[PDB]
Nucleic acid binder design. Structure first.
Ligand SMILES: Nc1ncnc2c1ncn2[C@H]1C[C@H](O)[C@@H](COP(=O)(O)OP(=O)(O)OP(=O)(O)O)O1
Ligand SMILES: [Ca+2]
Ligand code: NA
Length: 430
DNA sequence: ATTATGACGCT
DNA sequence: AGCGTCAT
């Protein structure tokens, strides 16, 4: 009853760029705009691997992970942009730099949590309170929400997409209590008005379009964001949760896409998020552990407490390369040359990072994969990172891995290595 | 022969 | 510390 928390204490948004690497390439090369197009890395092996796909190309069935030669079978006029290659490896600098452009804009509106190269969570609780004071009980016009969907509406007693959207928006606004400054639904709505403003500023200042979700926590905001992509934003209210979750496959909720979600399904014999409500908190803790159990019990009711962490910069800076099949590194000289290639890219990114962000990394993590292991990483060792110098870092990386060499011969490397990875971590202010 | 990242939980 | 999970 009156003591039952409803998880309506915050307004949180998740903003995610549409087909991000594709938009970066389309901005740069206008010939790619408004066309079926994809971004690919490498090219020699089956035309390159696809990492991003424009919405026009998705209509033909083109997807991430697909080889470009295969994508062309579905979409013969597919256009391609290639990721930059430097020092013999893919270099993602252009996209990291485009990401900073977007993140700096978002940061004008509120504190953000950088969730990936093209996604940030925003805690808007404070900004909403403020805007509510300016409004002074004044109603919110649909004109302030020109790209917003209200999940679950319209409902109750036109056949076009935009007409539906407006009908739902109208029902939502018609029902709002604008007189109550602490109404969660009102707070969400003001949140959405602010996100429209953030999304317009992003598009104006960078050319990039995005989608967004607005709800009371990160998981719902993330789920909401995906409901109406591209170039749209979706509000998911606390009230919309029972119907939304009633047919929502468990794997769709962030963190349940893998083995834990599979076990929730198998152990409990259910399919949808809403079905979770029938288990006690202790039942769920008994199957999935204390932390997961509590999290599930609240989450299936639309409640989650994970904070938007104040962090705009990545916590680690890493460089990795696979050496598949026949290309696996089998000689000491090969291993040393590639460690250097990786180490040079890392030095370049670290030096830039130190000048930009007033910090220095203090630990170097080195990770390899050996031919045969099903696991992505086979071994991980750390050493001190005391100077930003590529030759030193590559020398140290070798030292910590060289005893992995099974070969009795000095010059040979066995088993051959199928992945090398260098990562700078443990930053300190400077 | 997906590849290149990046955050966080467990012991 | 080193490994695993989950994500983009
Ligand atoms: N598995 C991956 N391997 C390499 N790069 C990836 C991978 N997944 C995503 N990326 C890169 C390319 C994407 O443009 C960018 C953002 O990813 P993501 O948000 O999942 O898709 P997207 O932005 O391309 O399309 P969407 O409009 O569906 O969000 O990160
Ligand atoms: Ca995206
Ligand atoms: Na994303």
């Amino acid at each position: 009853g009156p003591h039952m928390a409803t998880g309506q204490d915050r307004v949180v948004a998740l903003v995610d760029m549409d087909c991000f690497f594709v938009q970066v390439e389309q901005r740069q090369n206008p010939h790619l705009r408004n066309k079926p197009c994809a971004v690919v890395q490498y090219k020699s092996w089956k035309g390159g691997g696809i990492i991003a796909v424009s919405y026009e190309a998705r209509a033909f069935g083109v997807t991430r992970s697909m080889w470009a030669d295969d994508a062309k079978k579905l979409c013969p006029d597919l256009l391609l942009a290639q990721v930059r290659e430097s020092r013999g490896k893919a270099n993602l600098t252009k996209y990291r730099e485009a990401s900073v452009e977007v993140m700096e804009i978002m940061s004008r509106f509120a504190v953000i949590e950088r969730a990936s190269i093209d996604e940030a969570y925003v805690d808007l609780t404070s900004a909403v309170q403020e805007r509510l004071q300016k409004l002074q009980g004044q109603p919110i016009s649909a004109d302030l929400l020109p790209s917003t969907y209200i999940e679950g509406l319209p409902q109750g007693p036109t056949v076009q997409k935009e007409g539906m959207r407006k009908q739902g928006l109208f029902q939502w606004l018609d029902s709002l209590q604008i007189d109550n400054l602490t109404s969660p639904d009102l707070q969400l709505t003001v949140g959405a008005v602010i996100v429209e403003e953030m999304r317009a500023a992003i598009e104006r200042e960078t050319g990039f379009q995005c989608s967004a979700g607005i709800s009371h926590n990160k998981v719902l905001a993330k789920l909401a964001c995906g409901l109406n992509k591209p170039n749209r934003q979706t509000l998911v209210s606390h009230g919309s949760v029972p119907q939304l979750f009633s047919q929502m496959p468990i794997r769709k909720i962030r963190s349940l896409g893998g083995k834990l979600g599979a076990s929730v399904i198998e152990i409990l014999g259910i399919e949808y998020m809403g079905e979770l409500t029938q288990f006690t908190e202790s039942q769920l803790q008994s199957h999935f552990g204390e932390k997961n159990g509590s999290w599930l019990y609240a989450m299936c009711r639309g409640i989650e407490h994970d904070p938007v962490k104040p962090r705009q910069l990545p916590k680690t800076i890493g460089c990795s390369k696979n050496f598949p099949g026949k290309t696996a590194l089998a000689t000491r000289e090969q291993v040393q040359w590639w460690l250097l290639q990786l180490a040079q890219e890392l030095e370049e990114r670290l030096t830039k990072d130190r000048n930009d962000n007033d910090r220095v990394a203090t630990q170097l993590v080195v990770s390899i994969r050996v031919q045969g292991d099903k696991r992505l990483s086979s071994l991980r060792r750390c050493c001190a990172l005391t100077r930003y110098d590529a030759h030193k870092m590559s020398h140290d990386a070798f030292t910590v891995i060289k005893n992995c060499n099974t070969s009795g011969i000095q010059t040979e490397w066995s088993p051959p290595l199928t992945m090398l990875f260098l990562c700078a971590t443990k930053f300190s202010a400077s």
